[PDB]
Write a protein that binds this ligand. Structure first.
Ligand SMILES: C/C(=N\Nc1nc(=O)cc(C)[nH]1)c1ccc(N)cc1
Ligand SMILES: [Mg+2]
Length: 340
Protein backbone atom coordinates (compact mmCIF):
# COMPACT_ATOMS: atom_id res chain seq x y z
CA UNK A 1 0.00 0.00 0.00
CA UNK A 2 3.06 2.25 0.40
CA UNK A 3 3.08 5.68 2.02
CA UNK A 4 0.34 7.28 4.09
CA UNK A 5 -2.55 8.43 1.86
CA UNK A 6 -1.10 6.81 -1.30
CA UNK A 7 -3.05 6.34 -4.51
CA UNK A 8 -3.11 2.59 -3.73
CA UNK A 9 -4.77 3.23 -0.36
CA UNK A 10 -7.41 5.54 -1.92
CA UNK A 11 -8.28 2.96 -4.59
CA UNK A 12 -8.23 0.14 -2.05
CA UNK A 13 -10.50 2.08 0.29
CA UNK A 14 -13.31 2.63 -2.22
CA UNK A 15 -12.90 -0.84 -3.78
CA UNK A 16 -13.08 -2.40 -0.32
CA UNK A 17 -16.31 -0.49 0.39
CA UNK A 18 -17.76 -1.56 -2.96
CA UNK A 19 -16.86 -5.20 -2.32
CA UNK A 20 -18.46 -5.15 1.12
CA UNK A 21 -21.70 -3.68 -0.24
CA UNK A 22 -21.95 -5.97 -3.29
CA UNK A 23 -20.89 -9.24 -1.66
CA UNK A 24 -22.60 -8.46 1.67
CA UNK A 25 -25.90 -7.81 -0.16
CA UNK A 26 -26.67 -11.53 -0.57
CA UNK A 27 -26.90 -11.93 3.24
CA UNK A 28 -28.66 -8.66 4.13
CA UNK A 29 -31.05 -9.03 7.08
CA UNK A 30 -30.15 -12.69 7.62
CA UNK A 31 -30.49 -13.29 11.37
CA UNK A 32 -27.72 -15.89 11.19
CA UNK A 33 -25.13 -16.70 8.51
CA UNK A 34 -23.10 -19.91 8.21
CA UNK A 35 -19.41 -19.31 7.46
CA UNK A 36 -19.18 -22.26 5.03
CA UNK A 37 -21.94 -20.52 3.04
CA UNK A 38 -20.00 -17.26 2.72
CA UNK A 39 -16.88 -19.20 1.66
CA UNK A 40 -18.79 -21.30 -0.87
CA UNK A 41 -20.36 -18.10 -2.23
CA UNK A 42 -17.08 -16.16 -2.54
CA UNK A 43 -15.79 -19.13 -4.55
CA UNK A 44 -18.51 -18.07 -7.03
CA UNK A 45 -16.54 -14.83 -7.59
CA UNK A 46 -13.34 -16.57 -8.79
CA UNK A 47 -12.95 -17.50 -12.51
CA UNK A 48 -18.67 -9.34 -15.02
CA UNK A 49 -20.39 -6.70 -12.85
CA UNK A 50 -22.86 -9.42 -11.84
CA UNK A 51 -23.34 -8.13 -8.27
CA UNK A 52 -25.51 -5.03 -7.91
CA UNK A 53 -24.45 -2.33 -5.45
CA UNK A 54 -27.03 -0.94 -3.00
CA UNK A 55 -27.91 2.42 -1.47
CA UNK A 56 -24.64 2.24 0.49
CA UNK A 57 -22.60 2.62 -2.70
CA UNK A 58 -25.15 4.91 -4.41
CA UNK A 59 -24.86 7.44 -1.58
CA UNK A 60 -21.08 7.04 -1.31
CA UNK A 61 -20.71 7.87 -5.03
CA UNK A 62 -22.97 10.93 -4.74
CA UNK A 63 -20.99 12.18 -1.70
CA UNK A 64 -17.69 11.80 -3.57
CA UNK A 65 -19.13 13.31 -6.77
CA UNK A 66 -20.18 16.38 -4.74
CA UNK A 67 -16.72 16.80 -3.17
CA UNK A 68 -15.07 16.51 -6.61
CA UNK A 69 -17.51 18.92 -8.28
CA UNK A 70 -16.94 21.63 -5.67
CA UNK A 71 -13.42 20.68 -4.47
CA UNK A 72 -15.07 21.40 -1.14
CA UNK A 73 -18.02 20.52 1.04
CA UNK A 74 -21.25 22.18 -0.13
CA UNK A 75 -24.38 21.06 1.74
CA UNK A 76 -26.79 22.25 -0.96
CA UNK A 77 -24.91 20.49 -3.77
CA UNK A 78 -24.49 17.25 -1.79
CA UNK A 79 -28.09 17.21 -0.54
CA UNK A 80 -29.30 17.69 -4.11
CA UNK A 81 -27.04 14.91 -5.45
CA UNK A 82 -28.33 12.49 -2.81
CA UNK A 83 -31.95 13.36 -3.66
CA UNK A 84 -31.45 13.21 -7.45
CA UNK A 85 -29.63 9.85 -7.11
CA UNK A 86 -32.64 8.40 -5.28
CA UNK A 87 -35.05 9.88 -7.82
CA UNK A 88 -33.23 8.31 -10.77
CA UNK A 89 -32.63 4.94 -9.05
CA UNK A 90 -35.04 4.52 -6.10
CA UNK A 91 -34.86 0.71 -5.71
CA UNK A 92 -31.35 0.54 -4.25
CA UNK A 93 -32.61 -0.35 -0.74
CA UNK A 94 -33.32 2.99 0.99
CA UNK A 95 -35.32 2.98 4.25
CA UNK A 96 -38.71 4.77 4.27
CA UNK A 97 -37.27 7.36 6.67
CA UNK A 98 -34.47 8.62 4.43
CA UNK A 99 -36.88 8.58 1.46
CA UNK A 100 -39.06 11.11 3.34
CA UNK A 101 -35.93 13.29 3.58
CA UNK A 102 -35.17 12.96 -0.13
CA UNK A 103 -38.76 13.90 -1.09
CA UNK A 104 -38.47 17.11 0.96
CA UNK A 105 -35.05 17.90 -0.56
CA UNK A 106 -36.54 17.42 -4.06
CA UNK A 107 -39.07 20.18 -3.36
CA UNK A 108 -37.46 23.24 -5.07
CA UNK A 109 -39.01 25.37 -2.31
CA UNK A 110 -36.72 23.67 0.25
CA UNK A 111 -34.11 26.31 1.12
CA UNK A 112 -32.66 24.69 4.28
CA UNK A 113 -31.23 21.28 3.37
CA UNK A 114 -30.57 20.30 7.03
CA UNK A 115 -34.18 20.75 8.14
CA UNK A 116 -35.69 17.50 6.65
CA UNK A 117 -33.27 15.25 8.60
CA UNK A 118 -33.99 17.13 11.83
CA UNK A 119 -37.75 16.59 11.53
CA UNK A 120 -37.33 12.78 11.55
CA UNK A 121 -38.36 10.78 14.64
CA UNK A 122 -40.49 13.50 16.25
CA UNK A 123 -37.73 16.09 15.80
CA UNK A 124 -34.88 13.97 17.25
CA UNK A 125 -33.39 12.74 13.94
CA UNK A 126 -32.38 9.24 12.84
CA UNK A 127 -29.54 7.35 14.57
CA UNK A 128 -29.24 5.01 11.55
CA UNK A 129 -25.92 4.00 9.97
CA UNK A 130 -26.74 5.71 6.65
CA UNK A 131 -24.49 8.70 7.47
CA UNK A 132 -21.54 6.37 8.17
CA UNK A 133 -22.10 3.89 5.32
CA UNK A 134 -21.20 6.57 2.74
CA UNK A 135 -18.65 8.63 4.67
CA UNK A 136 -15.32 7.10 3.55
CA UNK A 137 -14.86 9.71 0.81
CA UNK A 138 -14.67 12.41 3.50
CA UNK A 139 -11.48 10.82 4.82
CA UNK A 140 -10.07 10.66 1.27
CA UNK A 141 -10.78 14.37 0.68
CA UNK A 142 -9.59 15.65 4.06
CA UNK A 143 -6.29 14.83 5.73
CA UNK A 144 -6.66 16.55 9.14
CA UNK A 145 -8.57 15.01 12.07
CA UNK A 146 -10.25 18.40 12.49
CA UNK A 147 -11.62 18.44 8.93
CA UNK A 148 -12.57 14.75 8.96
CA UNK A 149 -14.70 15.34 12.06
CA UNK A 150 -16.28 18.54 10.75
CA UNK A 151 -17.26 17.19 7.34
CA UNK A 152 -18.15 13.66 8.47
CA UNK A 153 -20.60 15.41 10.81
CA UNK A 154 -22.02 17.82 8.20
CA UNK A 155 -22.31 15.20 5.47
CA UNK A 156 -24.00 12.83 7.91
CA UNK A 157 -26.43 15.46 9.20
CA UNK A 158 -28.00 15.81 5.73
CA UNK A 159 -29.88 12.55 6.54
CA UNK A 160 -28.98 11.63 10.16
CA UNK A 161 -29.47 14.48 12.67
CA UNK A 162 -29.29 12.47 15.91
CA UNK A 163 -25.82 12.65 17.49
CA UNK A 164 -26.05 8.83 17.77
CA UNK A 165 -26.22 8.84 13.96
CA UNK A 166 -23.66 11.53 13.10
CA UNK A 167 -21.15 10.50 15.79
CA UNK A 168 -21.19 7.03 14.22
CA UNK A 169 -20.33 8.68 10.90
CA UNK A 170 -17.45 10.56 12.57
CA UNK A 171 -16.17 7.34 14.15
CA UNK A 172 -16.23 5.51 10.79
CA UNK A 173 -14.53 8.49 9.05
CA UNK A 174 -11.87 8.57 11.77
CA UNK A 175 -11.26 4.81 11.33
CA UNK A 176 -10.68 5.35 7.58
CA UNK A 177 -8.51 8.39 8.37
CA UNK A 178 -6.28 6.23 10.59
CA UNK A 179 -6.17 3.27 8.16
CA UNK A 180 -4.94 5.60 5.38
CA UNK A 181 -1.92 6.31 7.60
CA UNK A 182 -0.81 2.68 7.33
CA UNK A 183 0.79 0.19 9.68
CA UNK A 184 -0.40 0.35 13.30
CA UNK A 185 -0.90 -1.87 16.33
CA UNK A 186 -4.54 -2.73 16.95
CA UNK A 187 -4.02 -1.19 20.39
CA UNK A 188 -2.79 2.16 19.00
CA UNK A 189 -5.58 2.30 16.39
CA UNK A 190 -8.24 1.66 19.03
CA UNK A 191 -6.71 4.07 21.57
CA UNK A 192 -6.67 6.88 18.97
CA UNK A 193 -10.35 6.34 18.14
CA UNK A 194 -11.28 6.17 21.84
CA UNK A 195 -9.59 9.49 22.62
CA UNK A 196 -11.47 11.25 19.78
CA UNK A 197 -14.83 9.80 20.77
CA UNK A 198 -14.28 10.66 24.44
CA UNK A 199 -13.75 14.28 23.38
CA UNK A 200 -16.90 14.35 21.20
CA UNK A 201 -19.08 12.66 23.79
CA UNK A 202 -18.07 15.37 26.26
CA UNK A 203 -20.44 17.75 24.41
CA UNK A 204 -23.58 18.56 26.43
CA UNK A 205 -26.00 17.79 23.56
CA UNK A 206 -24.38 14.37 22.97
CA UNK A 207 -24.78 13.66 26.69
CA UNK A 208 -28.51 14.57 26.62
CA UNK A 209 -29.16 12.57 23.43
CA UNK A 210 -27.73 9.40 25.03
CA UNK A 211 -29.56 9.96 28.32
CA UNK A 212 -32.95 10.21 26.55
CA UNK A 213 -32.38 6.75 25.00
CA UNK A 214 -31.32 5.16 28.32
CA UNK A 215 -27.78 4.59 26.98
CA UNK A 216 -24.39 4.94 28.70
CA UNK A 217 -23.25 8.58 29.06
CA UNK A 218 -20.60 8.14 26.34
CA UNK A 219 -22.03 5.40 24.05
CA UNK A 220 -19.34 5.08 21.37
CA UNK A 221 -16.59 5.48 23.98
CA UNK A 222 -18.10 2.65 26.03
CA UNK A 223 -18.46 0.49 22.89
CA UNK A 224 -14.80 1.07 21.88
CA UNK A 225 -13.81 0.04 25.43
CA UNK A 226 -15.83 -3.17 24.93
CA UNK A 227 -13.96 -3.71 21.64
CA UNK A 228 -10.66 -3.57 23.57
CA UNK A 229 -12.00 -6.15 26.06
CA UNK A 230 -13.28 -8.40 23.22
CA UNK A 231 -9.89 -8.35 21.48
CA UNK A 232 -8.34 -9.71 24.70
CA UNK A 233 -10.99 -12.38 25.23
CA UNK A 234 -10.46 -16.09 24.59
CA UNK A 235 -12.56 -17.97 22.02
CA UNK A 236 -14.79 -15.10 20.93
CA UNK A 237 -17.62 -16.46 18.77
CA UNK A 238 -19.46 -14.53 16.05
CA UNK A 239 -22.56 -14.69 18.27
CA UNK A 240 -20.73 -13.12 21.26
CA UNK A 241 -19.56 -10.33 18.97
CA UNK A 242 -23.11 -9.64 17.74
CA UNK A 243 -24.34 -10.00 21.33
CA UNK A 244 -21.95 -7.35 22.70
CA UNK A 245 -21.61 -4.94 19.72
CA UNK A 246 -24.70 -5.58 17.56
CA UNK A 247 -25.25 -6.13 13.85
CA UNK A 248 -28.12 -3.71 13.29
CA UNK A 249 -29.03 -0.62 11.24
CA UNK A 250 -28.37 1.76 14.15
CA UNK A 251 -24.95 3.39 13.76
CA UNK A 252 -24.18 2.35 17.39
CA UNK A 253 -24.90 -1.28 16.53
CA UNK A 254 -22.88 -1.37 13.29
CA UNK A 255 -19.99 1.14 13.19
CA UNK A 256 -18.13 -0.28 16.26
CA UNK A 257 -18.84 -3.78 14.90
CA UNK A 258 -17.20 -2.89 11.54
CA UNK A 259 -14.17 -1.50 13.38
CA UNK A 260 -13.96 -4.67 15.50
CA UNK A 261 -14.02 -6.77 12.30
CA UNK A 262 -11.10 -4.77 10.89
CA UNK A 263 -9.06 -4.98 14.10
CA UNK A 264 -9.76 -8.67 14.77
CA UNK A 265 -8.85 -9.65 11.19
CA UNK A 266 -5.46 -7.92 11.32
CA UNK A 267 -4.37 -11.31 12.64
CA UNK A 268 -4.73 -14.71 10.90
CA UNK A 269 -7.82 -16.67 11.85
CA UNK A 270 -7.57 -20.52 11.52
CA UNK A 271 -11.36 -20.56 10.85
CA UNK A 272 -10.92 -18.66 7.54
CA UNK A 273 -8.53 -20.48 5.11
CA UNK A 274 -5.09 -18.84 5.12
CA UNK A 275 -5.29 -18.57 1.29
CA UNK A 276 -7.53 -15.52 1.74
CA UNK A 277 -5.63 -12.26 2.22
CA UNK A 278 -6.31 -9.81 5.06
CA UNK A 279 -8.88 -7.75 3.13
CA UNK A 280 -10.74 -10.86 1.98
CA UNK A 281 -10.67 -12.27 5.52
CA UNK A 282 -12.13 -9.01 6.92
CA UNK A 283 -14.95 -9.03 4.35
CA UNK A 284 -15.74 -12.71 4.90
CA UNK A 285 -15.67 -12.29 8.68
CA UNK A 286 -17.88 -9.18 8.68
CA UNK A 287 -20.50 -10.73 6.36
CA UNK A 288 -20.56 -13.86 8.56
CA UNK A 289 -21.91 -11.72 11.44
CA UNK A 290 -25.31 -11.41 9.70
CA UNK A 291 -27.83 -8.60 10.24
CA UNK A 292 -26.98 -5.47 8.25
CA UNK A 293 -24.20 -7.35 6.41
CA UNK A 294 -24.21 -4.91 3.55
CA UNK A 295 -23.39 -1.83 5.67
CA UNK A 296 -21.13 -3.57 8.20
CA UNK A 297 -19.12 -5.11 5.35
CA UNK A 298 -19.01 -1.86 3.36
CA UNK A 299 -17.64 -0.06 6.42
CA UNK A 300 -15.16 -2.76 7.41
CA UNK A 301 -14.16 -2.94 3.74
CA UNK A 302 -13.47 0.80 3.54
CA UNK A 303 -11.18 0.62 6.58
CA UNK A 304 -9.44 -2.58 5.48
CA UNK A 305 -9.01 -1.35 1.91
CA UNK A 306 -7.41 1.90 3.09
CA UNK A 307 -5.10 -0.10 5.36
CA UNK A 308 -4.13 -2.97 3.04
CA UNK A 309 -4.35 -1.07 -0.25
CA UNK A 310 -5.28 -2.00 -3.81
CA UNK A 311 -2.74 -4.87 -3.96
CA UNK A 312 -5.09 -6.82 -1.65
CA UNK A 313 -8.12 -6.16 -3.85
CA UNK A 314 -8.47 -9.39 -5.91
CA UNK A 315 -9.29 -8.51 -9.50
CA UNK A 316 -11.79 -11.39 -9.74
CA UNK A 317 -13.74 -10.00 -6.77
CA UNK A 318 -13.50 -6.35 -7.88
CA UNK A 319 -14.65 -7.18 -11.43
CA UNK A 320 -17.77 -8.98 -10.09
CA UNK A 321 -19.05 -5.66 -8.69
CA UNK A 322 -21.36 -3.27 -10.57
CA UNK A 323 -19.56 0.01 -11.27
CA UNK A 324 -16.06 -1.09 -10.09
CA UNK A 325 -14.40 1.02 -12.83
CA UNK A 326 -16.41 4.13 -11.91
CA UNK A 327 -15.59 3.54 -8.24
CA UNK A 328 -11.88 3.26 -9.11
CA UNK A 329 -11.98 6.45 -11.21
CA UNK A 330 -13.60 8.34 -8.34
CA UNK A 331 -10.83 7.16 -5.99
CA UNK A 332 -8.03 8.29 -8.32
CA UNK A 333 -9.80 11.63 -8.87
CA UNK A 334 -10.07 12.13 -5.10
CA UNK A 335 -6.30 11.52 -4.84
CA UNK A 336 -5.47 13.93 -7.71
CA UNK A 337 -7.78 16.67 -6.43
CA UNK A 338 -7.27 16.41 -2.66
CA UNK A 339 -3.90 14.59 -2.19
CA UNK A 340 -1.85 16.05 -5.05
C1 LIG B 1 -33.06 10.00 18.28
C2 LIG B 1 -34.34 9.23 18.37
N1 LIG B 1 -34.72 8.32 17.53
N2 LIG B 1 -34.04 8.12 16.39
C3 LIG B 1 -34.22 6.95 15.71
N3 LIG B 1 -33.53 6.74 14.58
C4 LIG B 1 -33.69 5.55 13.91
O1 LIG B 1 -33.08 5.36 12.84
C5 LIG B 1 -34.60 4.57 14.45
C6 LIG B 1 -35.25 4.81 15.60
C7 LIG B 1 -36.20 3.86 16.27
N4 LIG B 1 -35.04 6.01 16.24
C8 LIG B 1 -35.29 9.50 19.49
C9 LIG B 1 -36.67 9.44 19.29
C10 LIG B 1 -37.55 9.68 20.32
C11 LIG B 1 -37.08 9.98 21.61
N5 LIG B 1 -37.95 10.22 22.64
C12 LIG B 1 -35.69 10.05 21.81
C13 LIG B 1 -34.82 9.81 20.76
MG1 LIG C 1 -27.66 -1.21 1.31
Amino acid sequence: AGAARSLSRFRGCLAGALLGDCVGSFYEAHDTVDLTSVLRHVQSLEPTEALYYTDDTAMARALVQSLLAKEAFDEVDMAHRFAQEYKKDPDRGYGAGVVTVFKKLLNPKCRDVFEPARAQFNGKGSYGNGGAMRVAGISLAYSSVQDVQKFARLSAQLTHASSLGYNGAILQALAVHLALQGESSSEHFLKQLLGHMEDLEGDAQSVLDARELGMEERPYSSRLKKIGELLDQASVTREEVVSELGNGIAAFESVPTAIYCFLRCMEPDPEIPSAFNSLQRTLIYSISLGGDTDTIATMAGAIAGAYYGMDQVPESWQQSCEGYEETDILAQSLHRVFQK
